[PDB]
Design a protein around this ligand. Structure first.
Ligand SMILES: [Cl-]
Ligand SMILES: [Cl-]
Length: 162
C-alpha cells in the first residue's frame, strides 16, 4: 500500500464532473474544480486544467495525471509549511502518508488548523492524538474516511485499508 493506493480508495475515480461530499464540482480522483455553484465555471476550470476542450469528460490517463500533480503538490505544500514540515519530519513512512491524505482533502490551511492534534502526533502520543482528531467537523462530516486516516495515525500500519 502507498499514498496513491490509499487516496484512490478514499476518493474513488470518476471521469465525468461530479459533486463532492460538500457539494463542490470535482472530477477524477478527488480533484476539486471550483467552489462555485456554476457547472459552467467548473467546465472552464476543467478545460484549463487539461489543456483541451473537454466538455466535462476526461480519460483515465488525464485523471491520473491530475492525481500525480495533486499528490506532488500536497507533499510540497507540507514541506513548505512551517507548521506541517516539522510534524512530517517527525513521523515514520506510514503516518506520513496519513498526513498527506488529510492535506489532500482539506488543504494545508485546514490541516494546519489541527494544531493540538499535530502537537500530539509530534510527541508520538498516538491514542491521545486519535481522540483529539475525532473532535472535528472533519470526523463528523466524513466519519468512515476519517476513521481510516485516524487508525493509520494510531497504529502506524495500513490495517484500515486492508
Ligand atoms: Cl490544475
Ligand atoms: Cl467517509
Amino acid at each position: 500500500m502507498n499514498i496513491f493506493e490509499m487516496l484512490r480508495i478514499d476518493e474513488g475515480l470518476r471521469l465525468k464532473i461530479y459533486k463532492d461530499t460538500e457539494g463542490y464540482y470535482t472530477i477524477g480522483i478527488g480533484h476539486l474544480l471550483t467552489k462555485s455553484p456554476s457547472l459552467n465555471a467548473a467546465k472552464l476550470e476543467l478545460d484549463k486544467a487539461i489543456g483541451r476542450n473537454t466538455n466535462g469528460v476526461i480519460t483515465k490517463d488525464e485523471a491520473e495525471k491530475l492525481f500525480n500533480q495533486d499528490v506532488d503538490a500536497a507533499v510540497r505544500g507540507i514541506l513548505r509549511n512551517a507548521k506541517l514540515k516539522p510534524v512530517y519530519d517527525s513521523l515514520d513512512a506510514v503516518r506520513r502518508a496519513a498526513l498527506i491524505n488529510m492535506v489532500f482533502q482539506m488543504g494545508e490551511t485546514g490541516v494546519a488548523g489541527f494544531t493540538n492534534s499535530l502537537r500530539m502526533l509530534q510527541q508520538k502520543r498516538w491514542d491521545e492524538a486519535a481522540v483529539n482528531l475525532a473532535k472535528s467537523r472533519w470526523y463528523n462530516q466524513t466519519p468512515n474516511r476519517a476513521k481510516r486516516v485516524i487508525t493509520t495515525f494510531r497504529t502506524g500500519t495500513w490495517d484500515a485499508y486492508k
